[PDB]
Design a protein around this ligand. Structure first.
Ligand SMILES: [Cl-]
Ligand SMILES: [Cl-]
Lengths: 120, 122
């Protein structure tokens, strides 16, 4: 239940996700708040029976940066964990891969981190 | 991709089977140990469904949560990479494996590695 909803990073991005009962994540990622030309499909998975033990819940998702306005020839994956409660957060690291020639394949993949919370 | 749809093998004994939807969806199954049915997990992801015309790879990514009816590892792995078609077709990836952790152990939460998938067993 706790994952379903809207989340915001610290830079102006948003997503909206629904967590299905058997582990599915589906939704939309908006790279710039309030901009509908910046919406992309998100698909992923989560562990649908995490540990009672005060641990986070592991999850991941992908966005391919193609919609009817933009085709960046790239995709990003986020890997992380949801921690519920009053300061709920999804703490992630991400990999962004761009389609490249074989000669440029070594500069194909950027890495970073994102922390999502439930307020802007 | 006609090209992406099908079965892929890493160099360590894992396999997956994927279907690439016409509007960017990846769906399928990941088997961590070849011909072990208790080792099958749902895979979902995305690819860029209109890659460049010009011998560039096709970007894609997917997630497996390591839970099925036999195992719950309390973890999920994401792969990010690119498909390169042709004679020696490959999907070259880097992966992130995150485990659910306590807050004290959160800095030990995420493993990183790489995987190269081909269309024939290693
Ligand atoms: Cl589900
Ligand atoms: Cl599709």
């Amino acid at each position: 239940a706790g994952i379903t909803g809207t989340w915001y990073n610290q830079l102006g991005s948003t997503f909206i996700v629904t967590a299905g009962a058997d582990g599915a994540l589906t939704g939309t990622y908006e790279s710039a708040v309030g901009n509908a030309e910046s919406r992309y499909v998100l698909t992923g998975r989560y562990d649908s029976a995490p540990a009672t033990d005060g641990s986070g819940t592991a999850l991941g998702w992908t966005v391919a940066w193609k919609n009817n306005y933009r085709n960046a020839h790239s995709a990003t994956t986020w890997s992380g964990q949801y921690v519920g409660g009053a300061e709920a957060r999804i703490n992630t690291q991400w990999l962004l891969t761009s389609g490249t020639t074989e000669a440029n394949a070594x500069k194909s993949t950027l890495v970073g981190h994102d922390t999502f919370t439930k307020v802007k």
